[PDB]
Structure formats: C-alpha cells, structure tokens
C-alpha cells in the first residue's frame, strides 16, 4: 500500500463508526488506483444446423 498522512480526530461525523475521510489529493495523485485485467472468451462451436 501507500504511506498516508493520517490525523486522528473526529471530522463532522464523516468518520463515525470505522469510516475513513480521504482528501482529494489522494484521488488526484492516483495513489490507490489499481489496474484490473479481465478476460472474455468467445467460442465458435459446431452447431448441428
């Protein structure tokens, strides 16, 4: 993972019960952006018709 600057304080109920508030710089700098490669298949079969 990544090393995140973390402050321990309640912030307006946005970290209420094991919730996490994240800055928009973590989304801008693309720190937790993951790549998800996905394979689709297509089979050409011998139909009796």
């Amino acid at each position: 993972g990544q090393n995140m600057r973390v402050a321990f304080m309640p912030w307006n109920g946005y970290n209420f019960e094991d919730s996490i508030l994240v800055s928009e710089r973590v989304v801008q700098e693309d720190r937790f952006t993951t790549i998800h490669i996905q394979e689709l298949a297509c089979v050409s079969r011998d139909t009796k018709l």
């Binding site: 079969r45 139909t47 009796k48 018709l49």
Partner: protein, 207 residues
C-alpha cells in the same frame, strides 16, 4: 399481425432445447418492454387487450374486465333495440349482464374450450379424402364434414335465451330473435372490433 406475440410472451420461462443460445441484442424486442408497451397502450385500447387476454386464457382475471367493458358498451348502446329499451333499471342491468357474459363466452369459444372440439377432425377441420389419394397418388385434404371446416362446435345463441327466460319469463323465441338477439350479435361484433383496434394500437406503439 402483432398481438399474438404478446400472448407468447405471457407464459412462464420455457426451457430451450437447441445449440448456442442468447443472441444478446435488440433484434426484435425483449420480454419486459413488450409488457411495458402493453402498459403504454392501455390508456386507449384497453377493451381489446382485456378481451384478448381473457379469450386466450392468459391472465384469467381480465375476463371480468372484458365483461365489464362489454356491459358498459351495452349500457351505452341499448337505446336502439326495442326489446331492451323499455325495461326498468336493475332488470335491464341484469339482462345486460347475462347477455354480456354469454356474448363474451361466445367470443371466447374456440377449439380449446373444454367440450367443444370436433369429434372427427380433432380441431384441425381438415381430413384426408382417400379416393382422391387413390386416384391421384399424392396425399390430398378436404373439409371435415362433421365440423364443416371450422374445427369446433359453435356456441348456440339459445343458451343466453334459456338463461334470460329464467328472469324474463314472458319473452318467447320469436321476439328474442326479433328485438334482443341483434344486441347479442352487436356485442360479439364489438368484441372483435375492440380486439382489432387494440392490435392496431399495439402495432402503432411497438413500431
């Protein structure tokens, strides 16, 4: 034209038996948007949709809807038949109810009615003439002589007459044929008219 595909679509999910299924496109239509188009075409042309679903025994609750619409039509149209136009309120409502129910059962009657299929042809109305096959060599067909081509025993209109003369006793058969039975035939012609205009509006919607 357009309507009978929806009667195919009112069934449950049938199992397929073929090779590679699932075209996965919008080639014809889906199975839910046809019902959505039936919903869009219900504010106008609901009579024919209710009558069609009641006739083909899919959603067997709109039989009462079709009988109620036919009763409303008979209440609107009863002012041109000399036998019914002189009766009093609840009695005229009950005779309109009983001849509406019998007219709708006459419209509903096809070769799938229990006890109505032809004896010989088994509903097809098409038997094979053995002499023309013996002289021609090939296989031929002819009209089923018992059913006379229609494939089912038709509904006699005198059933409604017997069911109304338990309520109007002084109404004999000649005046029944003279000033009551045209209203009955007007009801079944109105059923066919409403089914045709509902098929037309369905084809106008899903075009």
């Amino acid at each position: 034209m357009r309507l009978e595909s929806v009667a195919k679509f009112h069934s449950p999910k049938s199992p397929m038996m073929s090779d590679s299924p699932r075209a996965t496109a919008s080639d014809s239509l889906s199975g839910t948007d046809v019902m959505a188009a039936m919903g869009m075409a219900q504010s106008q042309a609901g009579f024919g949709m209710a009558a069609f679903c009641g006739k083909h025994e899919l959603s067997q609750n709109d039989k009462q809807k079709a009988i109620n619409y036919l009763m409303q039509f008979a209440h609107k149209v009863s002012g041109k038949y000399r036998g019914v136009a002189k009766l009093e309120g609840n009695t005229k409502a009950k005779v309109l109810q009983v001849l509406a129910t019998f007219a709708y059962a006459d419209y509903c009657r096809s070769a799938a009615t229990p006890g109505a299929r032809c004896r010989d042809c088994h509903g097809t109305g098409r038997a094979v003439d053995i002499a023309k096959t013996e002289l021609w060599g090939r296989v031929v067909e002819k009209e089923c002589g018992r059913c006379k081509g229609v494939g089912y025993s038709r509904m006699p209109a005198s059933a409604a007459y017997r069911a109304v003369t338990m309520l109007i006793p002084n109404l004999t058969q000649p005046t029944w044929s003279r000033t009551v039975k045209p209203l009955y035939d007007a009801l079944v012609v109105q059923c066919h008219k409403e089914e045709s205009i509902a098929d037309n509006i369905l084809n106008a919607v899903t075009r």
